[PDB]
């Protein structure tokens, strides 16, 4: 229905705002663009499901997220990809892991404070209906 389309539109507006807020944070600059294979030729061979905030915006605009649950799975991928590709004790890897965990924690904290649980439940019920 048009009411269900309105619901998903509101979801996309909400997710674009959350994503924008993460992307303008200087801590999260490394997560804003795909890894350039030049710098990191082994990336695409180790990480099977690359994810970055530009890819998340693209997915929002392609109507790929019908729930906040599905969006947070891609935020979790940004975090787990960084924990897997950068696992060493050296400060460069520790800095990326801390920034990845902070992205993930920030996204979850914004959603906890600003997402209505009944709006998420409605999205989940429309998604399951199809
Ligand atoms: Cl830096």
Author numbering: 979 to 1108
Source paper text:
Bromodomain-containing proteins are a prominent class of epigenetic readers that recognize acetylated lysine residues, typically on histones. BRD4, a member of the bromodomain and extraterminal subfamily, which in fact contains two bromodomains, is perhaps the most widely studied family member and has been shown to be very amenable to binding druglike molecules. ATAD2 was proposed from computational druggability analysis to be less tractable than BRD4, attributed in part to it lacking the hydrophobic region present in the BRD4 ligand binding site, termed the “WPF shelf”, interactions with which are postulated to contribute significantly to ligand binding affinity. We demonstrate the utility of FragLites in mapping the binding sites of bromodomain proteins BRD4 and ATAD2 and demonstrate that FragLite mapping is comparable to a full fragment screen in identifying ligand binding sites and key interactions.
The remaining hits for ATAD2 (13/16) and BRD4 (9/26) were bound in allosteric pockets of their respective proteins. In both ATAD2 and BRD4, while the majority (22/42) of binding events involved ligands that contacted only one molecule, a significant fraction (FL2, 4, 5, 7, 10, 11, 12, 15, 19, 21, 22, and 24 in BRD4 and FL1, 2, 6, 7, 10, 28, and 29 in ATAD2) were involved in contacts with more than one protein molecule in the lattice. As such, the hits for these FragLites may not occur in solution.
